């Protein structure tokens, strides 16, 4: 018999096919009109988020692309690859316009909030202890166009005494700190203005940190781990605000704009789970992947999200009316008792 | 322990945490917090 529901759907999904290989990362740009993706293939893809149509591909790398970011102008994106390189690309035409070499695979890249720097995670391999490298891009004030790059990072944060190698990292608000996640499930924080010096760190997970993603304003963040837990954590003091407990090993987590939710995803060799960010309770499960979810991203306006799987597919979701009207009774009391 | 009063309390303490950070970011780098990307 046919399944019937009291109200309209929470979202509509479409499936993007492009990658013949497991997804490693999806990312929206700032206006949320573009989606960037990378996978175990040697090329990345750029999509329109409105209808899922592929705008083009970024070709040049010779192995897996582990990570992709896009600057705040949507002028350049940056990729880091198993082929031991980092590449900068012009988004308007797909051209590689700078390459940097690494002695080890590069597992994660991310632009600073103002576009002038990016970080790269260099894996530990053999005697290499791993690092977070920071690269500078000098820009034209008018066109935002690249004017100078150097072959060297301007600073290498070498794995710090008593931490395993970093796996994920990103920038806090206005790029004042870098927060890093580690292979031993710790988190640490580096003060950018004081030469990237260590500040503090904390135990958090039992296994390696698998993702870390910030809030819309970069003042707090969410982690996930294959130990099946996720934590909300405040940048300024690194205190734990919230914990989300699942029965599922977690590859990815995000904080939603606009609604007070969290999205988690993972799986064992398949559904994204939504949680209420404040009450720490599961509010839904969104089916559609054929294996584990490897990455999730949400648009900065909070009106769609994408998930990429081990199946090679990206699912793109546009939120409907029942999503934007989803409210606990206490939240309904809060809103109506305003005006 | 009223789940409903526990919920009103989590909501209260969240808004407190956010106003606190809000103050400390204003008197600090002149930055105003948000929950959705502004324009």
From Swiss-Prot, chain A:
The UniProt keywords, alphabetically, are: Cytoplasm, Initiation factor, Phosphoprotein, Protein biosynthesis, Repeat, WD repeat
By its UniProt entry, which SMART domains does this protein fall under? WD40 (SM00320)
The superkingdom listed in its UniProt entry is Eukaryota
* GO CC, any one term: eukaryotic 48S preinitiation complex
Cited PROSITE patterns = WD_REPEATS_1, WD_REPEATS_2, WD_REPEATS_REGION
Subcellular localization, as worded in the UniProt entry: Cytoplasm
The leader peptide range reads: none
Instruction: Enumerate the WD repeat regions by residue range.
Output: 18-57, 60-99, 159-200, 204-243, 288-327
Summarizing the function annotation, the protein's role is: Component of the eukaryotic translation initiation factor 3 (eIF-3) complex, which is involved in protein synthesis of a specialized repertoire of mRNAs and, together with other initiation factors, stimulates binding of mRNA and methionyl-tRNAi to the 40S ribosome. The eIF-3 complex specifically targets and initiates translation of a subset of mRNAs involved in cell proliferation.
Subunit composition and interactions: The eukaryotic translation initiation factor 3 (eIF-3) core complex is composed of TIF32, PRT1, NIP1, TIF34 and TIF35. The factors eIF-1, eIF-2, eIF-3, TIF5/eIF-5 and methionyl-tRNAi form a multifactor complex (MFC) that may bind to the 40S ribosome.
What other note does the entry give for this protein? Answer: Present with 2400 molecules/cell in log phase SD medium.
Protein's name in the database = Eukaryotic translation initiation factor 3 subunit I
Swiss-Prot record, chain B:
Its function?
Answer: RNA-binding component of the eukaryotic translation initiation factor 3 (eIF-3) complex, which is involved in protein synthesis of a specialized repertoire of mRNAs and, together with other initiation factors, stimulates binding of mRNA and methionyl-tRNAi to the 40S ribosome. The eIF-3 complex specifically targets and initiates translation of a subset of mRNAs involved in cell proliferation.
Organism (species): Saccharomyces cerevisiae (strain ATCC 204508 / S288c) (Baker's yeast)
* Assembly mode: The eukaryotic translation initiation factor 3 (eIF-3) core complex is composed of TIF32, PRT1, NIP1, TIF34 and TIF35. A subcomplex of TIF32, NIP1 and PRT1 mediates the interaction with eIF-1, TIF5/eIF-5 and HCR1. The factors eIF-1, eIF-2, eIF-3, TIF5/eIF-5 and methionyl-tRNAi form a multifactor complex (MFC) that may bind to the 40S ribosome.
Instruction: From the Swiss-Prot or TrEMBL record, state where the protein is found.
Output: Cytoplasm
Instruction: From the Swiss-Prot or TrEMBL record, give the protein name.
Output: Eukaryotic translation initiation factor 3 subunit B
Q: Which residues of the full protein are shown?
A: 700 to 738 of 763
Q: What is the lineage of its organism?
A: Eukaryota, Fungi, Dikarya, Ascomycota, Saccharomycotina
What family does this chain come from, according to its entry? Belongs to the eIF-3 subunit B family.
Q: What else is known?
A: Present with 47500 molecules/cell in log phase SD medium.
């Amino acid at each position: 018999g046919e399944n019937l529901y009291f109200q309209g759907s929470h979202m509509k999904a479409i499936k993007l096919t492009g990658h013949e290989r497991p997804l490693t990362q999806v990312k929206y740009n700032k206006e949320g009109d573009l989606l960037f993706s990378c996978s175990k293939d040697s090329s990345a893809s750029v999509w329109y988020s409105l209808n899922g149509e592929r705008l083009g591909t970024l070709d040049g790398h010779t192995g897996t692309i582990w990570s992709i970011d896009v600057d705040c102008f949507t002028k350049y994106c940056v990729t880091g690859s198993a082929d031991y390189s980092i590449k900068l690309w012009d988004v308007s035409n797909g051209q590689c316009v700078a390459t940097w070499k690494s002695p080890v695979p590069v597992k994660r890249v991310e632009f600073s909030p103002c576009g002038n720097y990016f970080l790269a995670i260099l894996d530990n391999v053999m005697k290499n202890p791993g690092s977070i490298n920071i690269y500078e891009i000098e820009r034209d004030s008018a066109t935002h166009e690249l004017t100078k790059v150097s072959e060297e990072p301007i600073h290498k944060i070498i794995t710090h005494e008593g931490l395993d190698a970093a796996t994920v990292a990103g920038w806090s608000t206005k790029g004042k700190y870098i927060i890093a996640g580690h292979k031993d499930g710790k988190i640490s924080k580096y003060d950018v203005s004081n030469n990237y010096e260590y500040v503090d760190s904390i135990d958090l997970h039992e296994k390696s940190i698998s993702d870390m993603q910030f809030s819309p304003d970069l003042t707090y963040f969410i982690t996930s781990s294959r130990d099946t837990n996720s934590f909300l954590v405040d940048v300024s003091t690194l205190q734990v605000l919230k914990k989300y407990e699942t029965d599922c090993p977690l590859n990815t987590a995000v904080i939603t704009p606009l609604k007070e939710f969290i999205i988690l995803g993972g799986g064992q060799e398949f559904e994204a789970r939504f949680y209420h960010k404040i009450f720490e309770e599961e509010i839904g499960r969104v089916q559609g992947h054929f294996g584990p979810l490897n990455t999730v991203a949400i648009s900065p306006q909070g009106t769609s999200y994408a998930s990429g799987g081990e199946d090679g597919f990206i699912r793109l979701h546009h939120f409907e009316k029942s999503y934007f009207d989803f409210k606990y009774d206490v939240e309904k009391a809060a809103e109506a008792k305003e005006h | 322990r009223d789940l409903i009063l526990h919920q009103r309390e989590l909501l209260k303490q969240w808004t407190e945490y956010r106003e606190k950070i809000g103050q400390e970011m204003e008197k600090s780098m002149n930055f105003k917090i948000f929950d959705v990307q502004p324009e």
